[PDB]
Each structure stands twice: as structure tokens, then as C-alpha cells.
């Protein structure tokens, strides 16, 4: 964003005015990675209780 865009002007006078530039800015979005610890789900421990694995 340009700070000084409007300037008090004098049509009756010729004088120099300093120039201005264009800036730029960067947004950001970090990546977070999650997971699950290994879970033991042996079929035997469920068939012993007679349940679907």
C-alpha cells in the first residue's frame, strides 16, 4: 500500500516533488503434518471374543 498518494498541489508554481515506489508483501501458510501411533489390532484377540475384525 502506498502511503502518500494525494499531495497538496499548486497550479501557480513549478517545483520538484520526490517520487514514490511500489512495495510488495508475502502471505504465508505453514504446513502441519500429524499422524497416529501404531495400533495393535490382531485378529485373534477379536475372534476369541467372537467379533468381526
Amino acid at each position: 500500500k502506498i502511503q502518500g498518494l494525494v499531495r497538496p498541489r499548486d497550479p501557480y508554481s513549478n517545483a520538484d516533488v520526490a517520487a514514490k515506489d511500489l512495495r510488495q508483501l508475502v502471505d504465508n501458510t505453514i504446513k502441519v503434518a500429524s499422524g497416529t501411533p501404531p495400533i495393535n489390532i490382531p485378529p485373534s484377540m477379536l475372534r476369541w471374543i467372537q467379533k468381526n475384525p
Binding site: P11, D16, V17
Partner: protein, 54 residues
Amino acid sequence: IIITDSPALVSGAAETLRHSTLGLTTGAILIEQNQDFDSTVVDGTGKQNITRQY
């Protein structure tokens, strides 16, 4: 007689001004406009107001 106040026909002043009159024939003087007209408009910044030129 063609009248013309052209500064090419006076050439002098005071008591030494020497008017010159020309007796021309058909096609005595030839003028061709070479139609090479170029006009630019140039503008400048960095001032309080924009400046143009022609």
C-alpha cells in the same frame, strides 16, 4: 498584380528600403509539400504539475 506583404520583397529601411516586384510566367515558382509531417507531444513528471510540449 498580386499584393503580398512578404518580407522577401522589402529588403531595407529608411531611405534604402528597396521594394522588389516579380514578373512571373506559368509555373515559374514550384512548391511541393513533401507530406513528411511529424508532430510529437512530450510530457514530463517530477514537478508539482504535468508539463507538456509540442
